[PDB]
């Protein structure tokens, strides 16, 4: 492992530069070395790779050694931060996986996929995300009481 002044490595640098071949080989060596590594702002490989542009690095990176389920500094899960970035394949494939398994195990601020998808105008993601999250948490009890119809 080698890095400079910033704590970012070649996995986060190749994961955000559309280098999916070299991010697949470096994602395999980094997948054996630092697959569960996060950034300085807790941007993990599923979080930063599923955050910037990458769906193939989230599928190949989440396929080899990164199981479905993560948590950021603000408890943003992979389905939650996938819904926070308005991603369709990341929140759809993340909601298809049984990490929270209902998409209703919310964050620390109640930021489930229905809350973050409902507050941001992400109803294309809140169709399936609030289909499971309304299959468990249709009465989405938030902290301020702002549910889907209330927020």
Main attributes of the structure:
No mechanoreceptor potential C isoform L; 1 chains; part of a larger assembly; elongated; 151 residues; mainly alpha
In short:
The PDB classes it as membrane protein. By secondary structure, this protein is an all-alpha fold.
Tell me about this structure:
The chain is mostly helical. Helix content is 40%, strand content 0%. It is built from 8 helices and no strands. Helix 7 crosses helix 8.
Separate helix tally: 8
Characterize the biggest β-sheet: none
Count of individual beta strands: 0
Determine the N-to-C terminus distance. 45 Å
Measured by DSSP, the beta-strand proportion falls in under 5%
Computed over alpha carbons, the radius of gyration is 16 Å
What are the secondary-structure elements, in order, as H or E? HHHHHHHH
Helical coverage, percent range: 40-55%
Shape: elongated
Q: Supply the helix-strand structural class.
A: mainly alpha
């Amino acid at each position: 492992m080698n890095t400079g002044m910033t704590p970012l490595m070649y996995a986060t640098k190749d994961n955000k530069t559309a280098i999916m071949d070299r991010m697949i080989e470096l994602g395999a060596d980094v997948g054996a070395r630092n697959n569960d590594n996060y950034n300085v702002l807790h941007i993990a490989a599923m979080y930063s790779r599923e955050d910037v542009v990458k769906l193939l690095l989230t599928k190949r990176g989440v396929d080899p050694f990164s199981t479905g389920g993560s948590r950021s500094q603000t408890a943003v899960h992979l389905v939650s931060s996938r819904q926070t970035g308005t991603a369709t394949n990341i929140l759809r494939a993340l909601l298809a996986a049984a990490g929270k398994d209902i998409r209703l195990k919310a964050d620390g601020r109640g930021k489930i996929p229905l809350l973050l998808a409902v507050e941001s105008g992400n109803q294309s993601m809140c169709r399936e995300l609030l289909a499971a999250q309304t299959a468990e948490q249709l009465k989405a009890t938030t902290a301020n009481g702002d549910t889907a119809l209330h927020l």
